[PDB]
Design a binder for this molecule. Structure first.
Ligand SMILES: CC[C@H]1OC(=O)[C@@H](C)C(=O)[C@H](C)[C@@H](O[C@@H]2O[C@H](C)C[C@H](N(C)C)[C@H]2O)[C@](C)(OC)C[C@@H](C)C(=O)[C@H](C)[C@H]2N(CCCCn3cnc(-c4cccnc4)c3)C(=O)O[C@]12C
Lengths: 142, 37, 175, 206
RNA sequence: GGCACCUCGAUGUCGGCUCAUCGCAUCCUGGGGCUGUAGUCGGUCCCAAGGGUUGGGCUGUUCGCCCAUUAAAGCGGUACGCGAGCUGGGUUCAGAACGUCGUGAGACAGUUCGGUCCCUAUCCGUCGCGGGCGCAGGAAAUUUGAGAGGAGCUGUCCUUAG
RNA sequence: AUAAGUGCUGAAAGCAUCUAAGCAUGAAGCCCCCCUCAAGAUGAGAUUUCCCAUUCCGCAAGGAAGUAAGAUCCCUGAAAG
């Protein structure tokens, strides 16, 4: 009979600056943090995660020829309605959706996985409204 | 061009240059202009 | 048997000034040229000499060891003297002129061809046939010279259109 | 990018300095007033509101009366908005008259088209029917819903439904004549909508 | 075509009509390289699926030939797309006849004439239209646009200029 | 912004080369511009304006019961259905 903690969950606000990293190795340590996999009071069904803020999304970088070759495909529900954007077309236009799509993938699926996606808010540049909450400046492990 | 999967020099003045990932034959004679594909 | 192993000597009219990280600025009587290089190649200043050195012996270090130095040398040459490309054009009623800065080629088309050398490039038209592109960068003089040659590449039957100095234009006998 | 909004009356027929007939729409625009001059500094985009009609007191509400009586004219029936206008010239409370347009220039016209109701695939989507004879029980019908392999119908199989009532723009229409004292535009051609209906006459996106 | 894996307590089978969508191995249009490409026209090849891609004669016909256009009259997927959407000419029921086979009753990827195309949509899915609640007060209007659909074709004539 | 293609500079590889760096053109195609829908965009947004923060309970949280601006039932109808 271990602890199965529910509504005893204090949530931390973190700042992860994305100004040089690869998005696969940033978002894998971010999407694991958004569920509270680093928190020892982890129960798999009550969202023990914390809040994550990503700042300077437009400077997150890639390896190899991924800027021109990694293609974000997005079909509509209409015939002939597959749309494509490259990684640079996502990068220079809006890096926030590109980062949020990585984290939507790497967060688990279901009602609570969408609830844990609700915790994260990716921004372009260093505007970051969110001063009302003490967001600590967070460094990633690798 | 000559887009053919067996690109090779024809005369003595043909040159085999791997341009941008594709092996081409570039010559002074423009019929010997080749590229694999 | 290597470009990058030799020296490049800088007697006069060329002052090479390392100013920022890899940004080499070279000043002189014609004009000044700035070029930012890759941070692996190292460039040392002997008294009026540039010396170029590579860290290792690798596929990319040999290439940069050629190109950084060769571009430095052409910066020195274009600061000392500058560059120019000659542009012969042959035809029946085929002609060039200039209005102010703008080159007006009335060559074969039913419209005028109006070329604007925006970055500061001196185009001579010494006579109604020739067009000379003159400036400081090979990368810019040769660029706008190819821009002029792209207006009309030469036909192989009658050599028409724009044409370089000693360009051996291929001849076909269309009968 | 100049524009007004008015109301449709009908079609007339006008000779133009020659024997040439021109089909004409008459649009009656009693002069509009800038009601709210939206700016970029808070709203993120530079547009402007215009109001067109004179409601009674009884028909209008206190939020309408307040929003209008910021610039005191009368509560108005049709408020719409023009994007990207010359915002140095317009000010809040300005009678935007019909004196703007002349007979020369090109004009884009947007109006809400006539409603047709629940109609079939042939009057709505212009499809063709099957034969009325040779034994056929097929006519006036929308077609095969699709192939079998997707186990469903694709999105966009055009079917019966309500036709009409969308906002619709006819582009590059031409003005014949302006009657500023009767507050009338005369426009060459056909303009979408029923009679007594509001139609906004912009300048053309040429 | 091989094999017989699903279906014989039923998976309607050709052609056409309606409605399309998709692939590119591109028929036209767009951009090109090579030429044994002078020019106009061409041949081949490369990139490109955005749009367009005709109306008749005979035939059940797909196909094919022909007529006359076109810028072009592209090939193939979707149960050789689409019969709880339609037709039923052909196949493939019972009548009958011909040729031929069989002693015979009868048989023929031989021909010919005639022959019942059932179903009030529960769910998904489409196309439209409402009602609830949400949107941390309750309201009336004007909106930004994430996103989504549409549109995207092309001839000839004059001038440059014989 | 590109695809095919065409190039400059230009090495690796004293040269040559559209090359690894650096640069530039270039299609009815891609993204827009054009037309429509569109905040249920649960990420539910944004403006302008109206109403105001009452009455009882109960020891509180909260409940109910008049309302305000506003809307609706019902009625006259068509440009809508
Ligand atoms: C009127 C519609 C008839 O359908 C069809 O016959 C026909 C249109 C079909 O296509 C139908 C759907 C068939 O199904 C097909 O069967 C095939 C063998 C196979 C097919 N798939 C499985 C592939 C399947 O679709 C089938 C087998 O019917 C034969 C269905 C089967 C259950 C029946 O037989 C069925 C009961 C028929 N039937 C039998 C009497 C028929 C004689 N009759 C005619 N007219 C009268 C009549 C008139 C007026 C008054 N009284 C009587 C009487 C009826 O009275 O009505 C029927 C439903």
């Amino acid at each position: 009979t271990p602890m199965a903690n529910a509504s005893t969950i204090e949530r931390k606000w973190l700042v992860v600056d994305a100004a040089g990293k690869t998005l696969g190795r940033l978002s894998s340590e971010v999407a694991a943090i958004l569920r509270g996999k680093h928190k020892p009071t982890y129960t798999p069904h009550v969202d023990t995660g914390d809040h994550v803020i990503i700042i300077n999304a437009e400077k997150i970088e890639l390896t190899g020829k991924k800027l021109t070759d990694k293609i974000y495909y997005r079909h509509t529900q209409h015939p002939g309605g597959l749309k494509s954007r490259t990684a640079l077309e996502m990068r220079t236009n809006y890096p926030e959706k590109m980062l949020e799509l990585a984290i939507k993938g790497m967060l688990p699926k279901g009602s609570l996985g969408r609830q844990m996606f609700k915790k994260l808010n990716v921004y372009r540049g260093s505007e970051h409204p969110h001063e009302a909450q003490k967001p600590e400046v967070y460094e990633l492990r690798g | 061009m000559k887009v053919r999967p067996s690109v090779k020099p024809i005369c003595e003045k043909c040159k085999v240059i791997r341009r941008k990932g594709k092996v081409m034959v570039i010559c002074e004679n423009p019929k010997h202009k080749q590229k694999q594909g | 048997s290597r470009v990058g192993k030799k020296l490049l000597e800088i007697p006069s009219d060329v002052t090479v000034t390392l100013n920022d990280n890899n940004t080499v600025a070279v000043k002189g009587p014609k004009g000044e040229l700035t070029r930012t290089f890759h941070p692996d190649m190292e460039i040392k200043v002997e008294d009026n000499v540039l010396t170029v050195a590579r860290p290792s012996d690798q596929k990319e270090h040999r290439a940069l060891h050629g190109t950084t130095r060769s571009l430095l040398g052409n910066m020195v040459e274009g600061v000392s003297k500058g560059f120019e490309r000659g542009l012969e054009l042959v035809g029946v009623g085929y002609r060039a002129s200039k209005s102010g800065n703008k080159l007006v080629l009335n060559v074969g088309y039913s419209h005028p061809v109006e070329i604007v050398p925006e970055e500061g490039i001196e185009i001579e038209v010494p006579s109604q046939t020739k067009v000379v592109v003159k400036g400081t960068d090979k990368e810019r003089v040769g660029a706008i010279a190819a821009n002029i040659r792209a207006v009309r590449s030469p036909e192989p039957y009658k050599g028409k259109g724009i044409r370089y100095e000693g360009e051996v234009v291929r001849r076909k006998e269309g009968k | 990018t100049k524009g007004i909004l008015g109301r449709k009356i009908g079609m007339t027929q006008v000779f133009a300095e020659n024997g040439d007939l021109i089909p004409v729409t008459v649009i009656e625009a009693a002069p509009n007033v800038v009601l709210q001059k939206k700016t970029a500094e808070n709203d993120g985009y530079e547009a402007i509101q215009l109001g067109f009609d004179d409601k009674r007191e009884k028909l209008s509400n206190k939020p309408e009366k307040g929003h209008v009586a910021k610039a005191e004219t009368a509560p108005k029936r049709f408020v719409k908005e023009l994007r990207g206008v010359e915002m140095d010239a317009y000010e809040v409370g300005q009678e935007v008259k019909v004196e703007i347009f002349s007979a020369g220039e090109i004009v884009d016209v947007t109006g809400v088209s006539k409603g047709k109701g629940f109609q079939g695939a042939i009057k709505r989507h212009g499809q063709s029917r099957g034969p009325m004879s040779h034994g056929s029980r097929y006519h006036r019908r929308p077609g095969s819903m699709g192939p079998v392999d997707p186990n469903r119908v694709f999105k966009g199989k055009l079917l019966p439904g309500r036709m009409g009532g969308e906002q619709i723009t006819v582009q590059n229409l031409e003005i014949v004549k302006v009657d500023a004292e009767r507050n009338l535009l005369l426009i060459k051609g056909n303009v979408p909508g029923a009679k007594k209906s509001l139609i906004t006459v912009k300048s053309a996106v040429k």
